[PDB]
C-alpha cells in the first residue's frame, strides 16, 4: 500500500536536461555583495540591455498598483530614496519592503523601471557618478555578461522578485484573449492533448482552463523555484506572471512511466512581454501526467544552451 510518485520524485523525470545552473549560481554570488555594489550592479546590468527590454506596455498596465509607493519615494529627499532602495536589495523587514513583496512580479518590475527612469532624470538619488564595483561585484557582473541575453533577464527577474521581505494579490485581473484571436500549437513528435491544451490555454491567457488540466495535488514548478501545489495556488501564480507570454513549443517526446503515468518532455522558447524582438529563452517543459491525463507535475526550466532543445530521446 504505497505511492507511484511524489512531487519530489516526479521532479527527476528526464535527467539529461541541462538547466542554466549559472543563473541561480550568479544570483547566489550577487547576494553576498554589499547593498551599494548590488544596486550599482543592477544599474549596469539593466542599462546594458538597452533595446532588449521593452518596458512600456507592462509598466503601464501594472503602474496603478505601485503608484502611491513610487510617489512616496519621489517626495523623499535623496538620502531617504537611497536608503529605501538599500532596504529592498538587503531584504530588510520594513513596511515598504513588505508592501513590495505583496506586489505582483510585473508591478515589482514596473516599480524598478520607474525608479530607473527617475534615477536617470535625478528625481531619485542615482548611482553615484563613476561608481565602481568591488572586485567581487565586478566578477558577478562579468558572469551575468557571459550569459545569453534571455538568461541575464532571468537573473534580473530572479533578483527583483526576491527583493523586500521574504499572497501576491496586488496585480491586475487577466483578460483571456478573444476566441477569434487564439493560436493552435503544433509540436513535433507529440500529440498529447493535455500538453497541447496547456500550451494553447497558456498562450490565450485562459488560466482557468489551464488550471483545469492539473490533478488536485498537481504542481507547477517555475525555473529555479519550488513547485506551486494545487489549483488555487497555481491559478494565483499564473495570474501574477503568465500574462503576455508567447510560448513556442517546438518538439518533444512521450514515454510511459511507472503505474500508467505518462512522462512528456517538450522543448521550445518563451517570449516574455518584457522582451525584445528575437529574445527568447530556450525552455524545457517536463510533464508528468497521471493515468487520467491530468498534470501531476509540469516543470519549466531555462535550458543551459540551445543544444538542449534537441536533447529528447532516450
- Under the rule (CB under 6 A), what is the footprint of ligand ECH? 39, 42-43, 46, 53, 85, 109, 112-113, 115-116, 119, 153-154, 156-157, 160, 202, 222-223, 241-242, 245, 247, 270, 272, 274, 281, 283, 285, 300, 302
Q: Which is nearer to ligand ECH, 65 or 274 (CB)?
A: 274
CB of 204 to ligand ECH, least distance (A): 13
Q: How far is the CB of 159 from ligand ECH (least distance, A)?
A: 7
Nearer to ligand ECH, 153 or 312 (CB): 153
* Least gap, CB of 291 to ligand ECH (angstroms): 23
Measured from the CB of residue 310, what is the shortest distance to ligand ECH in angstroms?
A: 18
| Minimum distance from residue 306 beta carbon to ligand ECH (Å) | 15
- What spatial distance separates the first Cα and last Cα of the chain, rounded to whole Å? 31
Closer residue to ligand ECH in complex, CB, 128/259: 128
Q: Find out whether 221 and 228 touch, Cβ atoms under 8 Å.
A: yes
In terms of CB distance, is 172 or 222 closer to ligand ECH?
A: 222
Q: Which of residues 154 and 263 has its CB atom nearest to ligand ECH in the complex?
A: 154
Amino acid at each position: 500500500s504505497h505511492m507511484t510518485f511524489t512531487i519530489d520524485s516526479a521532479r527527476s523525470i528526464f535527467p539529461n536536461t541541462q538547466v542554466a545552473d549559472a543563473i541561480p549560481a550568479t544570483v547566489a554570488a550577487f547576494n553576498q555583495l554589499s547593498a551599494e555594489d548590488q544596486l550599482a550592479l543592477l544599474w549596469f546590468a539593466y542599462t546594458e540591455m538597452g533595446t532588449t527590454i521593452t518596458p512600456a506596455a507592462m509598466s503601464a498596465a501594472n503602474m496603478i498598483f505601485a503608484e502611491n509607493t513610487l510617489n512616496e519615494i519621489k517626495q523623499m529627499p535623496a538620502l531617504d530614496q537611497s536608503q529605501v532602495m538599500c532596504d529592498l536589495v538587503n531584504q530588510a523587514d520594513s513596511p515598504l519592503c513588505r508592501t513590495y513583496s505583496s506586489f505582483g512580479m510585473n508591478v515589482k518590475l514596473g516599480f524598478w523601471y520607474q525608479l530607473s527612469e527617475w534615477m536617470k532624470e535625478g528625481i531619485v538619488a542615482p548611482i553615484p557618478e563613476g561608481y565602481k564595483l568591488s572586485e567581487d561585484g565586478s566578477d558577478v557582473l562579468e558572469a551575468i555578461r557571459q550569459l545569453e541575453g534571455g538568461q541575464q533577464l532571468s537573473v534580473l527577474r530572479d533578483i527583483v522578485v526576491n527583493m523586500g521581505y521574504v499572497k501576491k494579490v496586488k496585480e491586475p485581473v487577466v483578460p483571456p484573449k478573444d476566441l477569434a484571436s487564439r493560436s493552435k500549437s503544433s509540436i513535433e513528435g507529440i500529440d498529447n492533448p493535455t500538453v497541447l491544451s496547456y500550451m494553447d490555454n497558456m498562450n490565450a491567457f485562459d488560466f482557468q482552463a489551464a488550471v483545469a488540466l492539473f490533478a488536485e495535488d498537481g504542481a507547477l514548478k517555475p525555473p529555479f523555484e519550488e513547485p506551486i501545489v494545487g489549483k488555487e495556488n497555481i491559478l494565483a501564480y499564473m495570474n501574477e506572471q503568465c500574462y503576455g507570454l508567447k510560448l513556442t513549443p517546438q518538439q518533444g517526446v512521450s514515454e510511459s512511466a511507472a503505474g500508467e503515468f505518462t512522462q512528456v518532455k517538450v522543448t521550445g522558447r518563451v517570449q516574455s512581454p518584457w522582451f525584445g524582438d528575437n529574445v527568447g529563452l530556450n525552455l524545457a517543459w517536463r510533464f508528468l501526467l497521471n493515468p487520467q491525463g491530468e498534470i501531476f507535475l509540469v516543470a519549466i526550466d531555462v535550458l543551459a544552451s540551445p543544444k538542449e532543445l534537441m536533447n529528447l530521446g532516450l
